[PDB]
Design a protein around this ligand. Structure first.
Ligand SMILES: CNc1cc(CN(Cc2cccc(Cl)c2Cl)C(=O)c2cc(F)cc(F)c2)cnc1C(=O)O
Ligand SMILES: CNc1cc(CN(Cc2cccc(Cl)c2Cl)C(=O)c2cc(F)cc(F)c2)cnc1C(=O)O
Ligand SMILES: [Mg+2]
Ligand SMILES: [Mg+2]
Lengths: 210, 210
């Protein structure tokens, strides 16, 4: 018996590779927007009032050449920049950031069901924090945007169809979240309605592995 | 006997007004850059690998009309977006974010000595966390950039003198930090040298009030 989502947390991660490789997180971005920014609003500017967290993470293994080409990250470069692994302090930081947002929380990620949600659950499981985000909800924006539009349903393809130019910085987690936000601002009332109707408990997401 | 700063945390806050008004924080942005991004690098792009935290904060009082005009924030709007006050959870979040960066840490803020540093110390003092950032260092970028250039020494004026266009989004904490970073990337080796030579313990910054 959940109510209306109060915060939409636009969410994207980079990783060492695709799911079949048992990947690890290399970058994450959370962009928390209060529902009022969508309910009561060429390309729309982001809301003035948002919370943002963008962090790089040292994975415990090498990125694949393909992963490095598309994400612009490598394990060696992350290490040169002194990045720390996905550890208890990181999980605590994520939770403290989420706690600054009104509940209910809904993570919104493009192909989140395939990529971002199961990998986040796997990282948390490795720390023994298997219930840390049980109270959050989640939606996959490709599922939402397909349903609403009813071709390619990549961020870039959607954005270009809606706006005309290409999105900026397609190759970072932050760039992806910002493009997703812009898409979500096209018809924001409808998007928000769909999320409220379809949000799933994060606890129902199985870890990608382990 | 401190060594070389390992992380430069470009830092800007918005507040309810100027120091003589006993102001409170309304927005903060931390952009942590590893020294290697400056030491071993028209307008330079930001480094690929950075950590960023941008948060809005509910102050315990109204912003002045002048503050609202220049920052684009008001107490009522922050409240409509469900923002929380500057509390223990916030202080913990800030520390957890800083702990993901290699030490020594140096906060870098434009007119930081007048604005950002004393107000941060005042907020922490109100929570009884008077030593929380004792291990950090700080530099005021107006002091640095004056010394290095050796007219207006605002962010916009410097940026325009260095690059040609105007900076983007002069009216947000994040916009300010990003412009500051761009300025710092002009002659980054010299900037970094100056910081290492002049960094001050954050503990020597007196609270703005109280
Ligand atoms: C097609 N669109 C996406 C693809 C990915 C998969 N990638 C990037 C990647 C793309 C190609 C080849 C490779 Cl080798 C890699 Cl790594 C990830 O970084 C990624 C992240 C995750 F959170 C868990 C995961 F398994 C992979 C992530 N997000 C989107 C998006 O639309 O936001
Ligand atoms: C002139 N440049 C700046 C001025 C301020 C002062 N302001 C903005 C403001 C400007 C004018 C009139 C008003 Cl009424 C207000 Cl509020 C703050 O928001 C501010 C923040 C602090 F951290 C503590 C403080 F006391 C004020 C902050 N930063 C810069 C900068 O260069 O980054
Ligand atoms: Mg993605
Ligand atoms: Mg400032």
């Amino acid at each position: 018996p959940h109510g209306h989502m109060q915060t939409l947390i636009f969410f994207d991660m980079e990783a060492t590779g695709l799911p079949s490789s048992r990947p690890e997180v290399t970058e994450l971005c959370l962009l928390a927007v209060h529902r009022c920014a969508l309910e009561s609003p060429t390309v729309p500017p982001p809301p003035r009032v948002v919370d943002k967290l963008s962090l790089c993470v040292a994975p415990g293994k090498a990125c694949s050449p393909a992963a490095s080409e598309i994400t612009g990250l490598s394990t060696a470069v992350l290490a040169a920049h002194g990045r720390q692994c996905f550890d208890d302090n990181l999980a605590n930081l994520l939770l403290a950031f989420l706690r600054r947002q009104p509940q209910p929380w809904c993570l919104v990620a493009h192909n989140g069901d395939r990529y971002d949600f199961p990998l986040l659950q796997a990282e948390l499981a490795m720390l023994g924090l298997t219930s840390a985000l049980d109270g959050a909800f989640c939606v996959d924006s490709i599922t939402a945007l397909k349903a609403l539009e009813r071709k390619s349903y990549s961020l870039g393809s959607i954005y270009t169809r809606l706006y005309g130019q290409s999105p900026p910085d397609s190759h970072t987690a932050e760039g992806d979240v910002l493009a997703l936000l812009s898409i979500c601002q096209w018809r924001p009332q409808a998007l928000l309605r769909w999320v409220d109707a379809h949000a799933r408990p994060f606890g129902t997401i199985r870890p990608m592995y382990g």
